[PDB]
Design a protein around this ligand. Structure first.
Ligand SMILES: *[C@@H]1O[C@H](CO)[C@@H](O[C@@H]2O[C@H](CO)[C@@H](O[C@@H]3O[C@H](CO[C@H]4O[C@H](CO)[C@@H](O)[C@H](O)[C@@H]4O)[C@@H](O)[C@H](O[C@H]4O[C@H](CO)[C@@H](O)[C@H](O)[C@@H]4O)[C@@H]3O)[C@H](O)[C@H]2NC(C)=O)[C@H](O)[C@H]1NC(C)=O
Ligand SMILES: *[C@@H]1O[C@H](CO)[C@@H](O[C@@H]2O[C@H](CO)[C@@H](O[C@@H]3O[C@H](CO[C@H]4O[C@H](CO)[C@@H](O)[C@H](O)[C@@H]4O)[C@@H](O)[C@H](O[C@H]4O[C@H](CO)[C@@H](O)[C@H](O)[C@@H]4O)[C@@H]3O)[C@H](O)[C@H]2NC(C)=O)[C@H](O)[C@H]1NC(C)=O
Ligand SMILES: *[C@@H]1O[C@H](CO)[C@@H](O[C@@H]2O[C@H](CO)[C@@H](O[C@@H]3O[C@H](CO)[C@@H](O)[C@H](O)[C@@H]3O)[C@H](O)[C@H]2NC(C)=O)[C@H](O)[C@H]1NC(C)=O
Ligand SMILES: *[C@@H]1O[C@H](CO[C@@H]2O[C@@H](C)[C@@H](O)[C@@H](O)[C@@H]2O)[C@@H](O[C@@H]2O[C@H](CO)[C@@H](O)[C@H](O)[C@H]2NC(C)=O)[C@H](O)[C@H]1NC(C)=O
Ligand SMILES: *[C@@H]1O[C@H](CO)[C@@H](O)[C@H](O)[C@H]1NC(C)=O
Ligand SMILES: *[C@@H]1O[C@H](CO)[C@@H](O)[C@H](O)[C@H]1NC(C)=O
Ligand SMILES: OC[C@H]1O[C@@H](O)[C@H](O)[C@@H](O)[C@@H]1O
Ligand SMILES: OC[C@H]1O[C@H](O)[C@H](O)[C@@H](O)[C@@H]1O
Ligand SMILES: OC[C@H]1O[C@H](O)[C@H](O)[C@@H](O)[C@@H]1O
Ligand SMILES: OC[C@H]1O[C@H](O)[C@H](O)[C@@H](O)[C@@H]1O
Lengths: 400, 388
């Protein structure tokens, strides 16, 4: 979507995976969907390095809506959002963050809250712009294929007409099976900044694998459609929650990064462990995810040993490689060479291990190397021509 | 098996899950299957509280065998076990531990090492007793059903005849589908101290769930056959390795415990985290697993909320309850009462949360309680009647 936004994948925090549709503030005031929850997460994002590392979106998901007023205007739940949404947006903006919100293109939201039907699309867009929202996720429950075909373009047009840049996240393709001919990715790229292609993620490794395997099965279709301003969205990061081991958490971060995915966390930032913070705030990982070329990666190799290799092209003739073990036994010594991974030419390379920081020098196409990969885990390299180091130091500047 | 052994489920360490068939001692000397690995694990068991908490078996699995000598006597691989097996048995015994070993009722072990064919069963039993082994795991790769039907009883008889008490772990039923009519559990109970019913565990939560689900689906058959001296074996604990989250690690420990399973770890004790050590060395958990009645628990309730409740009866009118969440969303507030979980009337109970240590006192059958269960996790109670 050509609205100036999301030239790199969006980074931030979304309420849904961790906090879901918890509205019992009487019994569970610390974890319920409420203005307090968002204000506290905002504070954490401003204070604990998240914003400074690039995590700028704080997004409301389903179950925020109280109803519509006498004029049809959306209102948040007054008991849970007593100061209103404008107050919340002001607060978030005061901390250098952006506010996202949620609506559904259909009769109701997936959890049964008031829907944005076709006759409310424009009014709801205008309301969100008036509240100074910065992002909209538009779900597609309780609608027909025809309503979605009309509604998603209608909302993109309505948002545009407000004059406020609002990042637009579209669930449209997930409801149509994610593939052509039912999904037209050329249109999606013109009307949305990102789109959910496939199933909702759940807090399990099986869920991550299910999503990864669908994206890889269909990468010939999906890889080319992503780029600056228009991303595939494999759904939220699970890091910090209950279902992923350490190796699995590092794997999801690495694989979402190689896929040029949004880095949308959904976890309790108030209690997140240092170990998990270190994964999400890894500066090299983030640089890779945010690479300005915005070229989505691919799986380039799969071995009988159940080791898979993913590669993402990056700026300055660099690459990211993720060596991923689908084994379930023990650490595995994977023997390869850049030549076997379809690197050609006379380039000598160096690599930095993204998680350890260790440098491997003197890699030619023919050079045999070994990486030790843990089960359901990864090894990730930032790989660059060694001449990149010299060229970066030898740029001559003039005042203009 | 009526040999006086394993009147409670065995506790210890088994090499297989974590270390597998790693024989590359040149490239990977710290992690290969070797005398050194077992000695180092024995040292950790003696020094870091494992033995003292009840973890007493140190078990060799596949890939130890070097060949047979001119008399057909089994030998370990001389490069990886230079001092031989008696040396290792004697070492482990000096530390107050027991040594387990591995053989296969068939032409070869599962990884292709020399097998214990029918004509070698007695000689191999005699060799193991001479070496002063304390437990034998007998796998069943590379054999026929008829060979296994002859061989497993033959080995039980041969072990007995040596005069050395050797705990006998039998993989027989796993090769025949684990169920009647092909598996006869009254026969198994007579010839084995424990048996692998089902698939090898792998380092994944999906593997744990697959095993749990098969055990629960067939619990009407499996629950009654377990007892002192004869246990169902759902395979090794994964705690300390790579595939399980913290919640899942706590869940496996609790569920194996309510199932009266062996607690056979398979993890690097040299590098195990404090958090994982605390799960495995939980004294109340171990007390429950080792309960002298040896009554295997059952799943007693399954709710549309995807909360499952397991119960194990214990000594002195006590019980263990495991509240297990199969949800994959977020923590769940599970509302129940002991009356809804079929507890006996007019009794007042006290419960201890096995992981937190918190005490809940004065629970009557009608008393409503809430437990907060994390996704792919558990809450476990040790429950007993009280006066007051
Ligand atoms: C409603 O929808 C319309 C489209 O129908 C949107 O209009 C587009 O808005 C984007 C973003 O603001 C515009 O893109 C920007 O154009 C700037 C100016 O370029 C002009 O000059 C060139 C000359 O060759 C023309 O070709 C071009 O059409 C423009 O007239 C650029 O400077 C901007 O560059 C940005 O990215 C580069 C990265 O390479 C950075 O270096 C810059 O710093 C900068 O960030 C950018 O490309 C686009 O021109 C508009 N299109 C049209 C047709 O007008 C509205 O934004 C949208 N409104 C809302 C509210 O959503
Ligand atoms: C080789 O195989 C033989 C035959 O199976 C084994 O011999 C058996 O060993 C077990 C365990 O030591 C014996 O079981 C114990 O028997 C005790 C008394 O039994 C007497 O009465 C029976 C007839 O009723 C006679 O056969 C026997 O000779 C005795 O005179 C019991 O007191 C023990 O009870 C234990 O369990 C109960 C609950 O189950 C508890 O309440 C008790 O506290 C106690 O812990 C137990 O039942 C069995 O009797 C032996 N059988 C025979 C025929 O000798 C060998 O052990 C085995 N050898 C090796 C090396 O493996
Ligand atoms: C366990 O080992 C025994 C002994 O080695 C196996 O029996 C042997 O099996 C081999 C290979 O199948 C037989 O050789 C073959 O015989 C056929 C007969 O025509 C021939 O066409 C082949 O070219 C080949 O020579 C061999 O005869 C047989 N020997 C004996 C003494 O039985 C047995 O198969 C193994 N069992 C299991 C369950 O793996
Ligand atoms: C979205 O809602 C419309 C409007 O009808 C509402 O929903 C119905 C299920 C019912 O509860 C009505 O009382 C509500 O007002 C649905 O359109 C109706 O669809 C039914 C068939 O289900 C049809 O018989 C009616 O003619 C339709 N009514 C109107 C006014 O057009 C629509 O089907 C709903 N869409 C989805 C995807 O759920
Ligand atoms: C890489 O290893 C193979 C054997 O696996 C060997 O034949 C080859 O010479 C090695 N390449 C180099 C450049 O040493
Ligand atoms: C327990 O709660 C239920 C509501 O689900 C209520 O009907 C019942 O009276 C309560 N029982 C007691 C003993 O308070
Ligand atoms: O090929 C890889 C696989 O090898 C098998 O021998 C192991 O049991 C699996 O856990 C492992 O994933
Ligand atoms: O947990 C996996 C990571 O562990 C260590 O950091 C390794 O050095 C790194 O290569 C690997 O990716
Ligand atoms: O019923 C339990 C289930 O509810 C919802 O469908 C959630 O998406 C799922 O993660 C959870 O396990
Ligand atoms: O991680 C799960 C455990 O967390 C805490 O210890 C809880 O107090 C306990 O009830 C629960 O079983």
């Amino acid at each position: 979507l050509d609205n100036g936004l999301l030239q790199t994948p969006p980074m931030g925090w979304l309420a849904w995976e961790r906090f879901r549709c918890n509205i019992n503030c009487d019994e569970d005031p610390k974890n319920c969907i409420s203005e307090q929850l968002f204000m506290e997460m905002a504070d954490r994002m401003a204070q604990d390095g998240w914003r400074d590392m690039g995590y700028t979106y704080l997004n409301i998901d389903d179950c925020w809506i109280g109803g519509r007023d006498a004029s049809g205007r959306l209102m948040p739940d007054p008991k849970r959002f007593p100061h209103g949404i404008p107050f919340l947006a002001d607060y978030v903006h005061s901390l250098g963050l952006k506010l996202g919100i949620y609506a559904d293109m259909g009769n109701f939201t997936c959890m049964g809250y008031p829907g944005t039907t076709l006759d409310k699309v424009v009014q709801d867009a205008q309301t969100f712009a008036e509240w100074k929202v910065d992002m909209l996720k538009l779900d597609g429950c309780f609608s027909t294929p025809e309503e979605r075909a009309q509604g998603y373009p209608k909302m993109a047009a309505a948002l545009n007409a407000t004059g406020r840049p609002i990042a637009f996240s579209c669930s449209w393709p997930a409801y149509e099976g994610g593939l052509p001919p039912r999904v037209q990715y050329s249109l999606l790229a013109d009307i949305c900044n990102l789109w959910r292609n496939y199933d909702d993620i759940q807090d399990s490794w099986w869920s991550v694998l299910s999503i990864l395997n669908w994206f890889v099965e269909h990468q010939d279709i999906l890889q080319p459609v992503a780029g600056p301003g228009h991303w595939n969205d494999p759904d939220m990061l699970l890091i910090g929650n209950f279902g992923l081991s350490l190796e699995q958490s590092r794997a999801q971060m690495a694989l979402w990064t190689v896929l040029a995915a949004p880095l949308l966390m959904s976890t309790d930032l108030r209690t997140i462990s240092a170990q998990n913070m270190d994964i999400l705030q890894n500066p090299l990982m983030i640089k890779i995810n945010q690479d300005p070329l915005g070229i989505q990666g691919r799986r380039i190799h799969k071995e009988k040993s159940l080791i898979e290799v993913y590669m993402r092209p990056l700026s300055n003739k660099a690459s990211a490689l993720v060596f991923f073990s689908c084994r379930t036994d023990m650490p595995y010594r994977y023997h390869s060479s850049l030549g076997q991974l379809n690197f050609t030419g006379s380039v000598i390379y160096e690599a930095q291990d993204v998680y350890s920081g260790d440098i491997i020098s003197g890699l030619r196409d023919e050079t045999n190397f070994t990486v030790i990969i843990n089960p359901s885990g990864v090894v990730m390299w930032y790989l660059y021509p060694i001449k990149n180091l010299e060229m970066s130091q030898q740029h001559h500047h003039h005042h203009h």
